[PDB]
Amino acid sequence: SSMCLELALEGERLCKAGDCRAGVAFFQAAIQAGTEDLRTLSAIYSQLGNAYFYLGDYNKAMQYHKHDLTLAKSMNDRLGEAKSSGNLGNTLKVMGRFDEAAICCERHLTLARQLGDRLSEGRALYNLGNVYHAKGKHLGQRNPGKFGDDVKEALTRAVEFYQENLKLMRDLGDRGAQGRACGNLGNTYYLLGDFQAAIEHHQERLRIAREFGDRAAERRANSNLGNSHIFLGQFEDAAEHYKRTLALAVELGEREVEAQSCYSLGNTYTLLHEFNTAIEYHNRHLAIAQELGDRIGEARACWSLGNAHSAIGGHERALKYAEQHLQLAKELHDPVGESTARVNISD
């Protein structure tokens, strides 16, 4: 009981410090012989849940969040029940059990609405948007060929909840929260196909990111806008955003993101038939890629550069790029790339 309190206290301390396996050891050692006090016990269950979640042991995390939940229900602590419901729903979402997760998050929502807690209501809405979003993005992975009815249903629900959250955050005046909600809304709209709405929401996201001076969020929103413009056939605007993405990427010293941005601009100017300028970006991309030791991006770079040089007319260079391409495809063992190289090395 007292020994339990000490054990659990050191466990909590260890969890706040990052060491969660030791904290878990202390927590289990606390339950080994302890309270009595239901509040402390429930707290220990919660802490164990978040700790196991931290460690990636989602089974035990779900279980101890379940125990914290039933203990919270027994105490009729509505706010605590809301907390444990949210956590359980999160852990459930990560486990791919989206339905049960949705139910839990809905419990969090109705409890939050009951207590008049608009903050917890907002958190609940954001959670629901997240679980339905991830549901869609998973269903889309199970059947890659086509966004089925299921995926569009899930994504639609996610859009709805995200929008409700945005309404609440605008109503409360939480600018950053509006930023995150707008970003997610932009992503799920992008996945839904409505690229225009994606453009709008990502624009708002960029405005917020500029209001806070977060250049990482700026290059995020810029990259998203670049993609959303690429899929709208507005290659002008796509390059217009991609360039700013690269600028903010090099302003923050992001090597990988710089490479990606260069590849993006390369393909964009490839689509704009300005084959001369695209080879520049693809060359810079190959430079960064070969620098960081990225064989994958090196292979893709050889592919695009080869096809681009073939598009210009200097096939003497394109053949070399194709040879290096085959070498890379055979190096990391790629059944597709090897064939794609063998085809373009002759034809």
Partner: protein, 311 residues
Amino acid sequence: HPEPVASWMSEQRWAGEPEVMCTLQHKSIAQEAYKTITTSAVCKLVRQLQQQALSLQVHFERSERVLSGLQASSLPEALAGATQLLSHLDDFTATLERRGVFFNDAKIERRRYEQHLEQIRTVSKDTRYSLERQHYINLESLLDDVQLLKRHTLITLRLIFERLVRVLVISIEQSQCDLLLRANINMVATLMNIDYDGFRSLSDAFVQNEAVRTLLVVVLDHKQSSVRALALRALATLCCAPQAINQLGSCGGIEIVRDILQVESAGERGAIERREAVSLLAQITAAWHGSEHRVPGLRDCAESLVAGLAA
């Protein structure tokens, strides 16, 4: 069939920068113990006391400097500072009050503690009279009274800190749960992260309670190498004060630590334990007070012997 650009667009159909944010809620255990005694509460207490005592000490020091003429300040500023100093002293003495349970089997210590506390109260009252009433303020007596209050406060704090620390050291000495042993040793390691000399000094609090000997017993007898490493780490943070170092050498701690780094140079019973043992030897050899001739020549010899191998 394939094509670079078409592939790029195909894979870009799903890509999108996610607004990564964790919404996981947290239930604190401490609040479930907030809304006597345990070592945890004791440590929190000595930390609170330490910080408050520091903030008080800078006040005592400032008023000393001003009333001594060492620091330029107008008389109204001086008197105001003295008054608010007395206020802080009152608020602090209030926190020094109901602390009976820690004076178990310490009748002498409690008599002295209570006595000096009463002295603080009385002198504070008389001084506040001297400032509030009295036409011509005697600044000499004011400075004397301030310094006296500083004296009494120092002694008081020394006593209560000694008791509070004795709780922890005893808890280590009579451990019955290994996890809590590790936790407590870690608590003395944390408590001595920064060593002080003023009001918030815990040096003699750990020296008088034979913390060094206790931790050396932990090092000698414990089975797990991890706990031994923890104990060595805790020993290294006590060897800032010469008294504790003497208290280490008196137990033959140097010999023990020296034995840790060999045992016929065996592989087992390592290896972070070694890393903490050499840390202890390092903290010890850092003093080097102001004597010995061979203890410097050998040090320079090693300092050169390393420079040979490295360069």
